[PDB]
Amino acid sequence: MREIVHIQGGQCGNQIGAKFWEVISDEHGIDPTGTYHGDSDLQLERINVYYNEATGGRYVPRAILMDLEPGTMDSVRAGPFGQLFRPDNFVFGQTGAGNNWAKGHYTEGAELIDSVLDVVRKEAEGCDCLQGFQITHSLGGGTGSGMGTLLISKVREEYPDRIMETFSVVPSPKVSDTVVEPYNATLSVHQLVENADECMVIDNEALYDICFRTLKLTTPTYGDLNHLVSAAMSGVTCCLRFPGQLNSDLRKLAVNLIPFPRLHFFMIGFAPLTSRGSQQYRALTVPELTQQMFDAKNMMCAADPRHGRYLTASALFRGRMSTKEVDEQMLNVQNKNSSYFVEWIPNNIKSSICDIPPKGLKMAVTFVGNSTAIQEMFKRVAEQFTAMFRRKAFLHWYTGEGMDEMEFTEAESNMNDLVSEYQQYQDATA
Amino acid sequence: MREVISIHVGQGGIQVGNACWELFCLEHGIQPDGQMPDAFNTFFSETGAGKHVPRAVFLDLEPTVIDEVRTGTYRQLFHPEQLISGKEDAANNFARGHYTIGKEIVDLCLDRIRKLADNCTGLQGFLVFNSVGGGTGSGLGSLLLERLSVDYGKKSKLGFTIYPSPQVSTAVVEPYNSILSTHSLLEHTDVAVMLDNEAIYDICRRNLDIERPTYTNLNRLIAQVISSLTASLRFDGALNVDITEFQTNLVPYPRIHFMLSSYAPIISAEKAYHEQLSVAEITNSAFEPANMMAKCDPRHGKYMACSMMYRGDVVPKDVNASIATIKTKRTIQFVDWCPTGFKVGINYQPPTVVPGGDLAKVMRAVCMISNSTAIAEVFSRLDHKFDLMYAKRAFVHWYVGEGMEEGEFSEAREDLAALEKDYEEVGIET
Amino acid sequence: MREVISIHVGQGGIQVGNACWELFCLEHGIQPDGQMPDAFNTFFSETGAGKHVPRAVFLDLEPTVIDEVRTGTYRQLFHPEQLISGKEDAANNFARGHYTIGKEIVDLCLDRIRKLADNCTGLQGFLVFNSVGGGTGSGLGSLLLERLSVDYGKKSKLGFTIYPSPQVSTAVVEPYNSILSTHSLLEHTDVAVMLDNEAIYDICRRNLDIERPTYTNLNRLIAQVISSLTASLRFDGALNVDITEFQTNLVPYPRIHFMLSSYAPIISAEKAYHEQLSVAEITNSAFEPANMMAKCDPRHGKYMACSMMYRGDVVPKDVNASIATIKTKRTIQFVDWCPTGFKVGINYQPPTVVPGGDLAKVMRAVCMISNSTAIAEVFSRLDHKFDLMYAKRAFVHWYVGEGMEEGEFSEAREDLAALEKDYEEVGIET
Amino acid sequence: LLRNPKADPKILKKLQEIKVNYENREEKKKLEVVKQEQETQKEKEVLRKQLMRRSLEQG
Ligand SMILES: Nc1nc2c(ncn2[C@@H]2O[C@H](COP(=O)(O)OP(=O)(O)OP(=O)(O)O)[C@@H](O)[C@H]2O)c(=O)[nH]1
Ligand SMILES: Nc1nc2c(ncn2[C@@H]2O[C@H](COP(=O)(O)OP(=O)(O)OP(=O)(O)O)[C@@H](O)[C@H]2O)c(=O)[nH]1
Ligand SMILES: Nc1nc2c(ncn2[C@@H]2O[C@H](COP(=O)(O)OP(=O)(O)O)[C@@H](O)[C@H]2O)c(=O)[nH]1
Ligand SMILES: [Mg+2]
Ligand SMILES: [Mg+2]
């Protein structure tokens, strides 16, 4: 019951899913052949959340994979746990977008999306009670940031009451791999605020910083960043698949973390994270988890959370632990940092406990906090956008496929209005 | 399901095509007979049982080079009737190969192009090679580009032209046809890469330590650059790049698409292994002005956008840590309206070595394609050379008597003046 | 229980009959002696024990060719007294072979035809071969057709006539007897196929790459076309076609039954295997105007109906997918009153190769028999050639003195004018 | 500015003569071909008129 379907688009989203599904399968004891080989009874009670049942007793994820080029899905199939995905759900084009948002949203993405919407509708109509959808995509690419966001609007138009999740990677100015990143980032943020019920920003720069400083491993690769993102993704829905002292589905988090409908851009972090050589030194206790959870360097975004004030915060503890300690520590982390918490909403931290810890760990915490410090990312994105747009650089590529500069002006104005009205509440006082 | 077709016209084009086609056959394990004793599909086609046929066509009006090809070790590889050959050479006269003898041959080439294109299903684009300072090369390249631009339309075409050196020259009349061919491909080619011989001679002398190089050594380096550019289409990589994802990242405006390339490392086996060849040092060497593949000084102009490809065991975090260092340096400055200018690609397959060649085997390499404002100097010096002889109308009778009109020389001069004014207008800060 | 009888008259007819009879004997495994060391029954008959006898008769007034046949390796195959031979040649005079010497020979031929027909039980029809530009060939063909049309009535007769080339000619008087023979077979033959030599010379030169062809190379291609046409009667196939199923599909009106043929692929073993020879490319090559077996341009007229035969491992869905592509093209247009114009046949037996010949062994082939409005040009040019000499009554005395009346030339001219008017009347849209 | 090349007036005149001779040679080919087709008709009408007269005489 109350299950969700997985939809991913683009190369970055496909690579994120290729590790997210591996993590989920390892958590539930599903072999790469789809056969259950788990140890505990609880591993099968709520498997309908992510997995479907077919004849022969094997399980198949309800994931939908889409891209405008076939290479990435032809590569993910040969990887481990690549056989679980149903071949029918693979939809792809023969041309690609070339990191051009217009091509992936107006000319090419519009004709292809009917086929993927057909299978999306097939998956949603069938399921017992829908909880919602979760979306993984990147804002630095053309086909992803175009087709995914248009699909968001199409899904929202047909299921207005369901919940919608988006895990979005925004292009940081530090590690830049594409010159046209500001254009399709700014165009995508315009559409994303209007339809997504929840959004979670993730930055490659913050992932590299975490890998270099906390784990202290010499050579980070995309596999480590994907693993961290996958652990963070799994931590959110853990209590929906396992029993606990205070169960809290996604809708309950939506109620408690979004004060106003347009303020739904969160930054997350996962604890504990320790190096291989120091994993024996540390002792896992609730104070040790909560001190690392609110650490500024532990956030999955380069945004500095002590440059603003938290509107609200959430924590999803895992493992068996006493609730009194959790509540007193949450109170203590809020009394010692009163300057960084907005004062006109008292008791702005939500807590939840799940009795099933991750495989290999005795305690774990997932942190989701809505803070005013996120304005800095939109500020720098808009700064680069307005630095590049004033000369109409690279504009002809977009304008040759039916798009105009008016949609750029409206997007810039709406993004600046969002930036302004997000900080409006930072200076608000009672 | 992704394909590309390479066009070779003229003596220089055929001699660099031979150079790239030993390398591709060696890299995909195909013997010179064409027989193996799913990545080949980008350049080759399967015949059903046994041999592979290249997706390439060789053009020339002068039969000597084709006859040399049809008797060497590669006689069995190419299809017998795609090596189109003429009888009479254009003899460095541009008007000949555009108005007199090229027209009767161009129809067969277009028929061959159609017969090759109907086989491909996912055609990415075309590649073309031609030495600019010759009659048949420049003239037939211009005519083929003009026919293809209307037969196919929006398909992408890439041109690896070899412009004459600043002072070193083999002919005496090459500025005329160089200017005319630049006129022709200015409005007809999506990408043009600079390849003059003097810079590559200096590269060989300084790094490879060869004091008597021949054309084969130059063509092998060009072949390595081509392989590095197209590796991402036929090998698995953490950060892929497609051909269609260029005009959205390197071409700010439709007129400006001339850029100059560089490669690193270039080193011989006698002293390669004494140093570690870290990613930082190779990416520093790639940006050195003395390692430009065209004899132009990047210190004399701004950068617009840099697209640079890695291959081997490179890790993205090390790439970011090196892009930061380059942004730090005060001798390299980017244009004002471009905050981030780097597009990064990472591939896993290390560069392959050709036996008996110059380059050694290494695990890391970098190839950069950079668009800079300093390229206007070659246009200015070619224009100055052209004006000196066009003042007295020297050598014009060899062109007027081959069907070309008198006024055709002036409008190429006007288009070059327009291009030079445009390059100055773009490079000024706001 | 299905049979067919082939008639060979004249030097060209006998020389193409030899060409087809090596091929049939090779295809059915019969040695040149006639001995095998149930499909043979279409062309052969069993003698009770041992050898097989062809269902063919050879006619000529000039004894040289028959004497050459009766001494070659095939002396033991043919029945000794079905090689009817005369003493005096007609010497390119049509009136001779229709009024003077052919009448005394025609009775023996008709007796042989009766003796061969009484043996057959399921006689499908007759085949006849004759070069039109000769005296005995055209005259005896006309007389035999006229006798057969009344002796048997509704039995189908097929004529593989070889009309003279537009400009290339061996005689000087061949337009006269060509026009007279066209008059004779216009109202007497059910199907006539165009076979002029110039088009086949161009085919050999372009595809087979033979610069010095002889008549044998032409006759082998004609034999291959005949074998492809009659394969469906003696081999199992997914979509069979009979001879009697032609006038219901290719002949819109009783007067219009002249059509022109084409064959594909035509390629030598030196470069055949380098390309895959897909069904789409061969069916595209078959419709190329330069591959017509008669020197006529199909782009100058509409199509009426196309009957085209496949053989090998071709699958019907691939055939349909290629018929759609041809219907798509804008350079091939059908007549208004014919929505569908294709009749498709598929056979399993691949074409057989003759040792020492030109064609290589392939698994797929296509033979098309197409009726088009453009055929009127050959009639117009033959008429123009005829009028030039008939204006001054040149060479007429050679015909008036052989029993023919003066007015017989005019009515053939009137019938050609009627045919040309009919072809224009049919091709106009409603 | 542009291009006032101080070329010899004799060479400029010779280039203009070469251009006019090229244009005149190009013009001189095609007209003859079209003329041949026009000539090619008329012959058919004369022949067809002779034929019709003689077919009429022969009934
Ligand atoms: N890099 C490189 N350049 C070459 C090579 N061969 C010729 N060139 C250049 O080509 C220019 C002249 O054009 P060519 O390619 O030699 O001759 P072409 O293009 O066939 O034109 P034609 O003279 O009419 O035959 C010269 O100035 C050379 O610099 C080569 O092997 N490598
Ligand atoms: N395709 C082809 N045509 C031939 C061949 N031999 C002769 N012809 C054609 O036949 C025409 C003349 O008729 P022939 O067959 O040679 O002689 P005939 O039909 O026996 O008539 P007579 O001259 O009276 O003996 C010539 O214009 C040739 O074009 C041949 O072997 N192959
Ligand atoms: N975490 C992670 N990020 C990736 C990976 N591959 C690419 N990216 C990011 O995705 C961005 C490029 O997105 P792109 O591949 O063009 O998206 P697309 O246009 O939808 O295919 C780069 O800036 C990378 O930082 C990966 O395997 N893992
Ligand atoms: Mg040459
Ligand atoms: Mg004869």
Side-chain angles (χ1 to χ4, degrees):
Chain A
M1 293 317 216
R2 63 214 199 292
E3 59 264 61
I4 62 170
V5 308
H6 191 102
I7 299 172
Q8 63 201 50
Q11 178 183 308
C12 173
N14 278 300
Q15 305 300 123
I16 296 283
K19 193 61 62 153
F20 168 74
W21 279 112
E22 281 186 40
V23 163
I24 301 299
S25 296
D26 284 8
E27 191 167 299
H28 287 278
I30 306 292
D31 286 333
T33 74
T35 298
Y36 173 92
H37 272 87
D39 291 331
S40 64
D41 290 345
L42 288 75
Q43 265 178 268
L44 269 194
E45 319 196 20
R46 298 319 181 144
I47 199 156
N48 263 277
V49 171
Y50 277 123
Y51 284 101
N52 263 327
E53 191 65 70
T55 64
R58 83 184 267 157
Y59 316 86
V60 56
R62 47 167 50 107
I64 298 90
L65 275 66
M66 91 195 178
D67 189 358
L68 215 51
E69 53 90 12
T72 184
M73 293 182 286
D74 269 9
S75 67
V76 67
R77 204 211 291 100
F81 296 81
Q83 293 323 340
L84 282 72
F85 290 3
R86 208 69 272 173
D88 205 335
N89 285 12
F90 289 99
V91 297
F92 51 74
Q94 293 94 290
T95 71
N99 305 338
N100 175 46
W101 189 88
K103 189 137 67 188
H105 193 282
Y106 273 40
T107 62
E108 294 293 328
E111 198 276 331
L112 190 157
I113 191 167
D114 63 358
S115 67
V116 62
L117 183 63
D118 193 342
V119 70
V120 162
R121 191 173 295 115
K122 182 174 72 68
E123 270 298 346
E125 183 280 335
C127 55
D128 296 345
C129 177
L130 202 46
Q131 170 97 353
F133 313 76
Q134 57 162 81
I135 301 299
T136 74
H137 67 304
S138 178
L139 266 66
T143 182
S145 75
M147 201 145 68
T149 188
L150 186 155
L151 192 153
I152 308 284
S153 185
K154 288 216 178 317
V155 165
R156 204 81 191 111
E157 191 146 40
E158 293 179 353
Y159 305 83
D161 63 358
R162 299 276 79 77
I163 62 170
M164 272 285 288
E165 270 188 71
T166 47
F167 293 60
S168 308
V169 179
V170 298
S172 64
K174 203 279 193 175
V175 296
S176 66
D177 274 27
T178 300
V179 299
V180 67
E181 280 170 7
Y183 283 160
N184 61 9
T186 299
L187 285 164
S188 66
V189 175
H190 179 74
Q191 203 84 30
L192 191 59
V193 64
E194 190 181 6
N195 299 298
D197 291 331
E198 280 147 9
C199 182
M200 293 180 183
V201 285
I202 298 184
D203 315 330
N204 308 129
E205 152 192 24
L207 304 183
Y208 289 120
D209 195 308
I210 290 168
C211 284
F212 276 120
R213 284 191 31 81
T214 62
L215 312 172
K216 314 178 82 91
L217 60 84
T218 46
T219 60
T221 184
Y222 284 118
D224 292 333
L225 315 195
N226 285 275
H227 197 274
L228 305 174
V229 169
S230 279
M233 271 175 78
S234 88
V236 193
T237 186
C238 67
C239 65
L240 184 140
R241 286 176 289 121
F242 293 110
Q245 313 286 9
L246 292 99
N247 44 7
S248 184
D249 71 22
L250 311 171
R251 211 169 200 108
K252 178 131 93 174
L253 261 53
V255 170
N256 274 257
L257 282 71
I258 297 89
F260 297 100
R262 294 151 81 210
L263 283 73
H264 55 52
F265 290 87
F266 315 144
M267 68 201 158
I268 62 170
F270 177 79
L273 306 162
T274 186
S275 66
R276 196 62 92 170
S278 178
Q279 184 178 2
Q280 295 219 31
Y281 263 80
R282 263 172 81 180
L284 288 167
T285 60
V286 179
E288 289 293 328
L289 281 195
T290 187
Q291 63 84 30
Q292 199 178 331
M293 172 191 40
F294 274 80
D295 196 331
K297 70 180 180 181
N298 197 82
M299 281 325 99
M300 301 265 188
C301 297
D304 192 344
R306 33 181 150 81
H307 295 177
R309 295 189 295 172
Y310 284 106
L311 295 201
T312 187
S314 177
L316 281 84
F317 286 72
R318 296 196 93 212
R320 274 141 161 141
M321 65 183 73
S322 84
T323 81
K324 183 173 151 293
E325 191 156 70
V326 176
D327 300 301
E328 65 183 1
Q329 291 273 330
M330 294 298 102
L331 183 63
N332 173 279
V333 176
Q334 204 202 300
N335 289 324
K336 300 294 187 291
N337 299 334
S338 67
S339 175
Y340 298 95
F341 282 90
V342 58
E343 54 89 20
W344 56 261
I345 190 167
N347 289 113
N348 62 6
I349 320 182
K350 178 143 183 33
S351 296
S352 296
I353 298 88
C354 174
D355 310 313
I356 304 306
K359 204 182 71 83
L361 281 193
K362 305 193 302 218
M363 293 180 183
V365 165
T366 311
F367 175 84
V368 182
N370 195 352
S371 185
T372 58
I374 81 169
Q375 65 180 356
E376 192 68 27
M377 291 266 178
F378 304 140
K379 291 177 70 68
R380 64 192 40 180
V381 168
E383 172 179 15
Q384 294 191 116
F385 175 76
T386 193
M388 185 179 288
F389 185 72
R390 64 161 51 269
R391 290 312 279 291
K392 313 311 161 322
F394 295 78
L395 183 63
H396 76 287
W397 270 7
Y398 289 93
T399 61
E401 320 196 280
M403 202 210 299
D404 50 41
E405 69 276 15
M406 283 73 74
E407 302 171 77
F408 275 109
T409 300
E410 307 185 20
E412 169 62 28
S413 66
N414 210 17
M415 195 198 163
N416 199 336
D417 194 2
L418 183 63
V419 175
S420 180
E421 279 174 358
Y422 198 87
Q423 73 85 0
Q424 151 175 64
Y425 294 112
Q426 185 178 3
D427 292 278
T429 61
Chain B
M1 71 205 188
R2 78 203 71 76
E3 291 98 301
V4 63
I5 299 171
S6 66
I7 314 304
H8 298 104
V9 61
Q11 194 200 119
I14 288 157
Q15 292 181 358
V16 69
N18 283 332
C20 69
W21 281 111
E22 301 97 0
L23 179 78
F24 303 143
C25 287
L26 182 43
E27 176 162 1
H28 292 118
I30 292 159
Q31 285 179 350
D33 291 331
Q35 303 284 352
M36 281 166 157
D38 53 60
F40 69 82
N41 196 275
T42 285
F43 282 133
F44 295 85
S45 58
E46 199 49 26
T47 197
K51 66 182 291 187
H52 306 66
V53 188
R55 297 179 191 281
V57 63
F58 287 4
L59 276 80
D60 200 341
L61 304 161
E62 190 277 332
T64 304
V65 295
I66 298 284
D67 295 322
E68 191 46 287
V69 176
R70 282 188 317 233
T71 54
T73 186
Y74 301 138
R75 44 191 290 290
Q76 287 280 71
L77 183 66
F78 288 92
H79 196 289
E81 64 186 4
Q82 48 178 38
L83 281 73
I84 297 89
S85 188
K87 292 181 181 180
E88 182 65 26
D89 168 15
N92 291 297
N93 187 290
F94 169 90
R96 284 202 82 191
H98 194 295
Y99 290 101
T100 300
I101 58 190
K103 304 222 191 143
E104 311 188 325
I105 290 305
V106 74
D107 272 334
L108 266 58
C109 183
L110 270 293
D111 291 331
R112 183 62 31 200
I113 298 310
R114 176 196 34 111
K115 201 166 315 302
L116 269 163
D118 291 331
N119 188 268
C120 306
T121 187
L123 190 145
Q124 298 308 123
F126 296 92
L127 310 183
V128 65
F129 305 79
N130 58 318
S131 78
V132 68
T136 178
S138 65
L140 276 297
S142 297
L143 196 55
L144 289 176
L145 293 174
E146 281 216 310
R147 287 199 161 286
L148 290 169
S149 194
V150 65
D151 273 28
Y152 298 80
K154 54 173 82 93
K155 284 302 141 73
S156 56
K157 286 172 290 323
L158 284 75
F160 293 97
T161 45
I162 312 186
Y163 286 141
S165 297
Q167 85 274 31
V168 166
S169 80
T170 304
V172 299
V173 73
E174 80 281 339
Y176 274 41
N177 61 13
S178 279
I179 301 299
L180 288 172
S181 45
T182 300
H183 181 74
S184 180
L185 62 83
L186 181 83
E187 294 293 328
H188 265 298
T189 316
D190 306 311
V191 174
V193 186
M194 302 296 79
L195 283 169
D196 46 31
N197 293 340
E198 202 195 340
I200 310 169
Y201 279 152
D202 291 331
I203 301 299
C204 293
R205 194 191 70 71
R206 272 198 337 276
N207 298 58
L208 280 190
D209 189 359
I210 309 185
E211 293 179 353
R212 174 31 191 181
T214 190
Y215 275 145
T216 70
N217 304 104
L218 305 177
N219 302 312
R220 296 165 175 300
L221 277 296
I222 297 169
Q224 283 274 69
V225 165
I226 306 302
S227 179
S228 291
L229 192 173
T230 60
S232 88
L233 281 153
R234 54 208 165 89
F235 289 106
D236 213 41
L239 217 52
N240 313 70
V241 163
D242 306 333
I243 297 169
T244 187
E245 296 177 8
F246 273 10
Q247 75 91 25
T248 57
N249 273 7
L250 275 184
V251 186
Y253 303 104
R255 294 270 285 198
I256 304 138
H257 55 70
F258 300 85
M259 72 291 291
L260 72 165
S261 63
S262 310
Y263 187 79
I266 290 187
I267 190 167
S268 54
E270 295 293 329
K271 274 252 181 163
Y273 304 128
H274 286 174
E275 65 183 1
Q276 63 184 358
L277 277 296
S278 177
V279 57
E281 41 176 330
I282 75 167
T283 191
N284 283 358
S285 302
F287 291 166
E288 282 186 60
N291 294 332
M292 295 299 103
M293 212 73 98
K295 182 62 66 68
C296 178
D297 199 340
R299 288 177 292 214
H300 290 166
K302 304 314 194 80
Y303 280 89
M304 293 180 183
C306 182
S307 167
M308 65 180 288
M309 321 285 198
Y310 290 76
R311 45 195 298 186
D313 71 30
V314 65
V315 180
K317 64 98 177 182
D318 277 314
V319 167
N320 275 20
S322 296
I323 300 298
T325 288
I326 307 295
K327 292 182 183 292
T328 300
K329 297 264 198 283
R330 294 129 162 80
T331 191
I332 303 165
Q333 60 211 308
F334 280 38
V335 68
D336 186 74
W337 41 254
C338 205
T340 183
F342 302 87
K343 170 86 165 137
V344 61
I346 299 150
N347 191 359
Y348 294 132
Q349 183 85 18
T352 182
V353 64
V354 60
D358 294 330
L359 277 296
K361 58 141 172 192
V362 287
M363 50 166 46
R364 287 173 279 276
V366 59
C367 166
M368 65 179 288
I369 301 299
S370 64
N371 194 358
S372 68
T373 76
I375 194 66
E377 321 296 310
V378 297
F379 299 133
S380 68
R381 57 164 60 99
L382 265 64
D383 189 359
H384 201 77
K385 270 164 198 281
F386 173 92
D387 283 338
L388 287 169
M389 312 181 276
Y390 191 68
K392 294 172 311 163
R393 332 159 195 183
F395 299 95
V396 179
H397 71 295
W398 270 21
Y399 289 86
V400 180
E402 296 293 329
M404 196 163 33
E405 301 285 349
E406 173 58 288
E408 288 273 11
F409 278 101
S410 68
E411 68 182 2
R413 179 66 178 86
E414 303 178 29
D415 278 10
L416 276 184
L419 181 61
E420 293 179 354
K421 184 162 141 283
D422 287 359
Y423 262 92
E424 190 276 332
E425 182 283 339
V426 175
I428 62 172
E429 316 88 11
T430 176
Chain C
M1 71 205 188
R2 78 203 70 76
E3 291 98 301
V4 63
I5 299 171
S6 66
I7 314 304
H8 298 104
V9 61
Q11 194 200 119
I14 288 157
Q15 292 181 358
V16 69
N18 283 332
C20 69
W21 281 111
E22 301 97 0
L23 179 78
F24 303 143
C25 287
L26 181 43
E27 176 162 1
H28 292 118
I30 292 159
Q31 285 179 350
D33 291 331
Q35 303 284 352
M36 281 166 157
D38 53 60
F40 69 82
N41 196 275
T42 285
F43 282 133
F44 295 85
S45 58
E46 199 49 26
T47 197
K51 66 182 291 187
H52 306 66
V53 188
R55 297 179 191 281
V57 63
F58 287 4
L59 276 80
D60 200 341
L61 304 161
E62 190 276 332
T64 304
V65 295
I66 298 285
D67 295 322
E68 191 46 287
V69 176
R70 282 188 317 233
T71 54
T73 186
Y74 300 138
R75 44 191 290 290
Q76 287 280 71
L77 183 66
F78 288 92
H79 195 289
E81 64 186 4
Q82 48 178 38
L83 282 72
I84 297 89
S85 188
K87 292 181 181 180
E88 182 65 26
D89 168 15
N92 291 297
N93 187 289
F94 169 90
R96 284 202 82 191
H98 194 295
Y99 290 101
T100 300
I101 58 190
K103 304 222 191 143
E104 311 188 326
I105 290 305
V106 74
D107 272 334
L108 266 58
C109 183
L110 270 293
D111 291 331
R112 183 62 31 200
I113 298 310
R114 176 196 34 111
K115 201 166 315 302
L116 269 163
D118 291 331
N119 188 268
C120 306
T121 187
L123 190 145
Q124 298 308 123
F126 296 92
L127 310 183
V128 65
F129 305 79
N130 58 318
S131 78
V132 68
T136 178
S138 65
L140 276 297
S142 297
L143 196 55
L144 289 176
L145 293 174
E146 281 216 310
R147 287 199 161 286
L148 290 169
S149 194
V150 65
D151 273 28
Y152 298 79
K154 54 173 82 93
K155 284 302 141 73
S156 56
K157 286 172 290 322
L158 284 75
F160 293 97
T161 45
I162 312 186
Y163 286 141
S165 297
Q167 85 274 31
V168 166
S169 80
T170 304
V172 299
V173 73
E174 80 281 339
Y176 274 40
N177 61 13
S178 279
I179 301 299
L180 288 172
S181 45
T182 300
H183 181 74
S184 180
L185 62 83
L186 181 83
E187 294 293 328
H188 265 298
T189 316
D190 306 311
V191 174
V193 186
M194 302 296 79
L195 283 169
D196 46 31
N197 293 340
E198 202 195 340
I200 310 169
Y201 278 152
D202 291 331
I203 301 299
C204 293
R205 194 191 70 71
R206 272 198 337 276
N207 298 58
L208 280 190
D209 189 359
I210 309 185
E211 293 179 353
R212 174 31 191 181
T214 190
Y215 275 145
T216 70
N217 304 104
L218 305 177
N219 302 312
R220 296 165 175 300
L221 277 296
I222 297 169
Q224 283 274 69
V225 165
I226 306 302
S227 179
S228 291
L229 192 173
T230 60
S232 88
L233 281 153
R234 54 208 165 89
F235 289 106
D236 213 41
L239 217 52
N240 313 70
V241 163
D242 306 333
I243 297 169
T244 187
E245 296 177 8
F246 273 10
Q247 75 91 26
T248 57
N249 273 7
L250 275 184
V251 186
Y253 303 104
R255 294 270 284 198
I256 304 138
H257 55 70
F258 300 86
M259 72 291 291
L260 73 165
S261 63
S262 310
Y263 187 79
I266 290 187
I267 190 167
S268 54
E270 295 294 328
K271 274 253 181 163
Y273 304 128
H274 286 174
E275 65 183 1
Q276 64 184 358
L277 277 296
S278 177
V279 57
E281 41 176 330
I282 75 166
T283 191
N284 283 358
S285 302
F287 291 166
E288 281 186 60
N291 294 332
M292 295 299 103
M293 212 73 98
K295 182 62 66 68
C296 178
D297 199 340
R299 288 177 292 214
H300 290 166
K302 304 314 194 80
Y303 279 89
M304 292 180 183
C306 182
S307 167
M308 65 180 288
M309 321 285 198
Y310 290 76
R311 45 195 298 186
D313 71 31
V314 65
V315 180
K317 64 98 177 182
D318 277 314
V319 167
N320 275 20
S322 296
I323 300 299
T325 288
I326 307 295
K327 292 182 183 292
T328 300
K329 297 264 198 283
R330 294 129 162 81
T331 191
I332 303 165
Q333 60 211 308
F334 280 38
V335 68
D336 186 74
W337 41 254
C338 205
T340 182
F342 302 87
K343 170 86 165 137
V344 61
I346 299 150
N347 191 359
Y348 294 132
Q349 183 85 18
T352 182
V353 64
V354 60
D358 294 330
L359 277 296
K361 57 141 172 192
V362 287
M363 49 166 46
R364 287 173 279 276
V366 59
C367 166
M368 65 179 288
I369 301 299
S370 64
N371 194 359
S372 68
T373 76
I375 194 66
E377 321 296 310
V378 297
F379 299 133
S380 68
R381 58 164 60 99
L382 265 64
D383 189 359
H384 201 77
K385 270 164 198 281
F386 173 92
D387 283 338
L388 287 169
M389 312 180 276
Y390 191 68
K392 294 172 311 163
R393 332 159 195 183
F395 299 95
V396 179
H397 71 294
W398 270 21
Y399 289 86
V400 180
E402 297 293 329
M404 196 163 33
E405 301 285 349
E406 173 58 288
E408 288 273 11
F409 278 100
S410 68
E411 68 182 2
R413 179 66 178 86
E414 303 178 29
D415 277 10
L416 276 184
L419 181 61
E420 293 179 354
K421 184 162 141 283
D422 287 359
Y423 263 92
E424 190 276 332
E425 182 284 339
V426 175
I428 62 172
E429 316 88 11
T430 176
Chain D
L1 199 119
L2 255 224
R3 74 348 101 137
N4 264 347
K6 289 184 177 180
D8 190 326
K10 284 186 174 186
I11 297 297
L12 288 168
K13 197 182 180 190
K14 203 80 179 178
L15 286 169
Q16 214 170 13
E17 281 174 355
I18 291 164
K19 187 177 179 175
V20 172
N21 277 339
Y22 179 87
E23 287 174 358
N24 282 335
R25 279 180 180 180
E26 260 261 322
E27 268 197 337
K28 211 181 184 189
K29 260 135 169 213
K30 221 144 8 167
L31 298 229
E32 295 175 351
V33 203
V34 147
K35 214 171 136 197
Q36 143 76 125
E37 278 145 11
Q38 253 232 340
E39 280 144 359
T40 264
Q41 194 132 112
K42 273 179 178 173
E43 285 180 336
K44 279 180 178 177
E45 264 200 333
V46 173
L47 210 86
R48 198 178 190 179
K49 276 174 180 158
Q50 278 185 344
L51 280 164
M52 285 170 183
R53 283 179 182 179
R54 219 164 184 175
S55 63
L56 274 159
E57 268 168 358
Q58 291 175 348

